[PDB]
């Protein structure tokens, strides 16, 4: 019930990227889901601002929003993409594609 | 109407920190507010995962949430705190307290 990494399988044609991504068809991107509320967990790595804003949200729930559970570290995947000549080319480390860690920010 | 930094003045007794923070009474913490939706802005620095998840949210709005507008860089403030001897001590760089930049994550 707190900020944590959970599964998210993404299909590239569902998001309109199949026009340039030949392969893979789908990959595990994960997502960060869960609440940022007190008491927090031991491993969500909360920033001081995320802690402060969550406290302000308690006192003023209609004015200030709470902190958000988001990726704090991302990992690459490899993709096979068509280049300007229609030739399948490998992008070995397409960065920023999969969640490695989540946290409250 | 997009991810951007906006004002947020925090009062320490409102959040229960006045028991250990003698001064200042209030500070400008800012907050990151705005939507992460297409078309994005030129300066929100979106990660590839935040872009992918926003596209998945369009196709499956009830299953996957959108990306979140969050601080991507924080700045310190100085605080005057009482130490274990009841003596006011200065913490020159209390890190992570104020928003320097926002972005979609
Ligand atoms: Cl806590
Ligand atoms: Cl911090
Ligand atoms: Cl590329
Ligand atoms: Cl590479
Ligand atoms: Cl390598
Ligand atoms: Cl890349
Ligand atoms: Cl765009
Ligand atoms: Cl990225
Ligand atoms: Cl301290
Ligand atoms: Cl310091
Ligand atoms: Cl200095
Ligand atoms: Cl610090
Ligand atoms: Na309120
Ligand atoms: Na609000
Ligand atoms: Na490219
Ligand atoms: Na390698
Ligand atoms: Na849906
Ligand atoms: Na949802
Ligand atoms: Na301390
Ligand atoms: Na200085």
Author numbering:
A (entry chain A), B (entry chain A): 325 to 429
What did the study's authors say about this model?
BMP-9 and BMP-10 are TGF-β family signaling ligands naturally secreted into blood. They act on endothelial cells and are required for proper development and maintenance of the vasculature. BMP-9 and −10 are synthesized as pro-proteins and processed by furin to release growth factors comprised of two cystine-knotted protomers that can covalently homo- or hetero-dimerize via a single cysteine in the dimer interface. Unlike other ligands of the TGF-β family, BMP-9 and −10 are secreted as a mixture of disulfide-linked dimers and monomers, in which the interchain cysteine (Cys-392) remains either paired or unpaired.
